[PDB]
Amino acid sequence: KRVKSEYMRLRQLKRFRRADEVKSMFSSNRQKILERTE
Amino acid sequence: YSFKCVNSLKEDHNQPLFGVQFNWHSKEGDPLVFATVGSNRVTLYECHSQGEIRLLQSYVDADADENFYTCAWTYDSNTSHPLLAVAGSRGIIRIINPITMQCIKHYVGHGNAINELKFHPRDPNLLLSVSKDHALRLWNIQTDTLVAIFGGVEGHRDEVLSADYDLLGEKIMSCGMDHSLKLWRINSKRMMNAIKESYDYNPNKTNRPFISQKIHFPDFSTRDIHRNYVDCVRWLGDLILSKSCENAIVCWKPGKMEDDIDKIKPSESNVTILGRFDYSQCDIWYMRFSMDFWQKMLALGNQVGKLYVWDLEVEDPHKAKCTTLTHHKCGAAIRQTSFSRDSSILIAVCDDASIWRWDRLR
Amino acid sequence: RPRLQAQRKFAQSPPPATQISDLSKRKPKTEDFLTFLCLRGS
């Protein structure tokens, strides 16, 4: 069926917002990386 | 970001090797030393300039037949000598002192082959041993006592493959053939009471056998990520990395993006995937990836002899990176990658008892 | 078929019946094997 079609359709905006947030998460986590590594 | 083949070697027994481990306990300035284990031999080399590598030492076991599997560099708090331990199919764990060129400790408590050895980033007397016995053990290599046995009513059902400390050393992940990935904790009160106890026991003192700790429950788990084997996992700050035979490496976090790592309820039943990484021709299992001590680059061997390299930087995993350094000599396979404390050199083992070397030009 | 193929680890893929001296021939086989006559019992 066309389930995957609408799945990816909504996943467009879902993954847009998700990319924004995970960029924030990348930043935060890389930071802690710096700390602990040092 | 450019390594070049400045040397390549080959053994004589021609039996495939698996292990590559720089000694990441080099007092600043000391020469680069690294080792590699094969069918039933170990090998000691040193990195020299101009793509020179110098044979240093090598031992062998004759009294039986084994295919050594893993190694790990540590030291001695008492006199600061370098320390290397290895283990193979027979399931025994040996501990060798190159300063005297002898083995000083051997451990036998498993039931099958061993698959990996790692140490606690802080404590140097804590050895984690992963086996095929579905049981992940953990020893005090100093007082000669076991501590924990993770596995049981809720453990792994088939041949645990790979594990990885968290960056700080209080959390572990595990992966095995059963598509299953489970979380263990070390920070629990009970656990650290146990450890402190372990550091205190005289057999001559008591008529009692030391009492280990059995743990029958993961902190959290799932099998929804892959639909095939899972054979290498890496902590990423507080994120996760794992590979399968599905020719893609994945990064995720448990629960939801909002879900903290240290609030996770044991009955958690959701995970958050972030991104995927891609490559070609990893259609067999038992192949590992590594990362720099500075957590900025990614290395990975390959089946057909290629390479694939990324950066652990702000490069968005959608289009993070793509770097394939290649040579025309062996395309048998490559098992394992390894960096120095810095990112100077990178070694990898081909499937045909042949070594490679790649010197970086940043 | 894809969900039916087993996964794979690796890739796709004397004449002279001389004497006892054969003993003394065997234990030294390098570094001045004495008596100079054991080589015939190779």
UniProtKB/Swiss-Prot annotation, chain A:
Superkingdom classification of source: Eukaryota
Subcellular localization, as worded in the UniProt entry: Nucleus
Phosphoserine PTM sites in chain numbering: 5
Family of this protein: Belongs to the class V-like SAM-binding methyltransferase superfamily. Histone-lysine methyltransferase family. EZ subfamily.
Quaternary structure and partners: Component of the PRC2/EED-EZH2 complex, which includes EED, EZH2, SUZ12, RBBP4 and RBBP7 and possibly AEBP2. The minimum components required for methyltransferase activity of the PRC2/EED-EZH2 complex are EED, EZH2 and SUZ12. The PRC2 complex may also interact with DNMT1, DNMT3A, DNMT3B and PHF1 via the EZH2 subunit and with SIRT1 via the SUZ12 subunit. Interacts with HDAC1 and HDAC2. Binds ATRX via the SET domain. Interacts with PRAME. Interacts with CDYL. Interacts with CLOCK, BMAL1 and CRY1. Interacts with DNMT3L; the interaction is direct.
Connected disease: Weaver syndrome: A syndrome of accelerated growth and osseous maturation, unusual craniofacial appearance, hoarse and low-pitched cry, and hypertonia with camptodactyly. Distinguishing features of Weaver syndrome include broad forehead and face, ocular hypertelorism, prominent wide philtrum, micrognathia, deep horizontal chin groove, and deep-set nails. In addition, carpal bone development is advanced over the rest of the hand.
Role noted for this protein: Polycomb group (PcG) protein. Catalytic subunit of the PRC2/EED-EZH2 complex, which methylates 'Lys-9' (H3K9me) and 'Lys-27' (H3K27me) of histone H3, leading to transcriptional repression of the affected target gene. Able to mono-, di- and trimethylate 'Lys-27' of histone H3 to form H3K27me1, H3K27me2 and H3K27me3, respectively. Displays a preference for substrates with less methylation, loses activity when progressively more methyl groups are incorporated into H3K27, H3K27me0 > H3K27me1 > H3K27me2.
Full protein name: Histone-lysine N-methyltransferase EZH2
Swiss-Prot record, chain B:
GO molecular function terms attached to this record: chromatin binding; enzyme activator activity; identical protein binding; methylated histone binding; transcription corepressor binding
Annotated region described as Interaction with EZH2, given as residue ranges: 2-362
Annotated S-S bridges: none
Gene Ontology biological process terms, A to Z: cellular response to leukemia inhibitory factor; facultative heterochromatin formation; genomic imprinting; heterochromatin formation; negative regulation of DNA-templated transcription; negative regulation of transcription by RNA polymerase II; oligodendrocyte differentiation; regulation of adaxial/abaxial pattern formation
Sites of N6,N6-dimethyllysine modification: 118, 189, 205
Modifications after synthesis and translation: Methylated. Binding to histone H1 'Lys-26' promotes mono-, di-, and trimethylation of internal lysines.
Effect in UniProt of substituting residue 114 to N: Impairs interaction with EZH2
GO cellular component annotations of the record: chromatin silencing complex; cytosol; ESC/E(Z) complex; nucleoplasm; nucleus; pronucleus; sex chromatin
Entry superkingdom: Eukaryota
Effect of residue 223 to S: In COGIS; decreased trimethylation of 'Lys-27' of histone H3
Modified sites of kind N6-methyllysine: 118, 189, 205
Alphabetical keyword list: Acetylation, Chromatin regulator, Chromosome, Disease variant, Host-virus interaction, Methylation, Nucleus, Phosphoprotein, Repeat, Repressor, Transcription, Transcription regulation, WD repeat
Positions of the UniProt region annotated as Required for interaction with the matrix protein MA of HIV-1: 70-224, 222-362
Induction: Expression is induced by E2F1, E2F2 and E2F3.
Positions annotated as WD repeat: 12-55, 63-106, 109-149, 155-196, 225-262, 280-320, 329-362
Subcellular location: Nucleus; Chromosome
Tissue spec: Expressed in brain, colon, heart, kidney, liver, lung, muscle, ovary, peripheral blood leukocytes, pancreas, placenta, prostate, spleen, small intestine, testis, thymus and uterus. Appears to be overexpressed in breast and colon cancer.
Modified residues (N6,N6,N6-trimethyllysine): 118, 189, 205
Notes on the domains: The WD repeat domain mediates recognition of trimethylated histone peptides at the consensus sequence Ala-Arg-Lys-Ser. This is achieved through an aromatic cage encircling the methyllysine, and involving Phe-18, Tyr-69 and Tyr-286.
Family, per entry: Belongs to the WD repeat ESC family.
Name of the protein in question: Polycomb protein EED
Curated annotation (Swiss-Prot), chain C:
Region (Sufficient for interaction with the PRC2 complex) residue spans: 17-42
Subcellular location: Nucleus
Residue spans crossing the bilayer: none
Highest taxon listed in the record's lineage: Eukaryota
Tissue-wise expression: During embryogenesis, predominantly expressed in neurons and particularly in dorsal root ganglion cells.
Written domain comment of the UniProt record: The ARID domain is required to target the PRC2 complex to its target genes.
Role according to the record: Regulator of histone methyltransferase complexes that plays an essential role in embryonic development, including heart and liver development, neural tube fusion process and hematopoiesis. Acts as an accessory subunit for the core PRC2 (Polycomb repressive complex 2) complex, which mediates histone H3K27 (H3K27me3) trimethylation on chromatin. Binds DNA and mediates the recruitment of the PRC2 complex to target genes in embryonic stem cells, thereby playing a key role in stem cell differentiation and normal embryonic development.
Subunit structure: Associates with the PRC2 complex, which consists of the core components EED, EZH1 or EZH2, SUZ12, and RBBP4, and various combinations of accessory subunits including AEBP2, JARID2, PHF19, MTF2 and EPOP. Found in a monomeric PRC2.2 (class 2) complex consisting of at least SUZ12, RBBP4, AEBP2 and JARID2. Facilitates nucleosome binding of the PRC2 complex. Interacts with SUZ12 (via C2H2-type zinc finger domain); the interaction is direct; competes with EPOP for SUZ12 binding. Interacts with histone methyltransferases EHMT1/GLP1 and EHMT2/G9a. Interacts with GATA4 (via the N-terminal region).
Protein name: Protein Jumonji
The species this protein was found in: Homo sapiens (Human)
Residues of the full protein shown: 108 to 166 of 1246
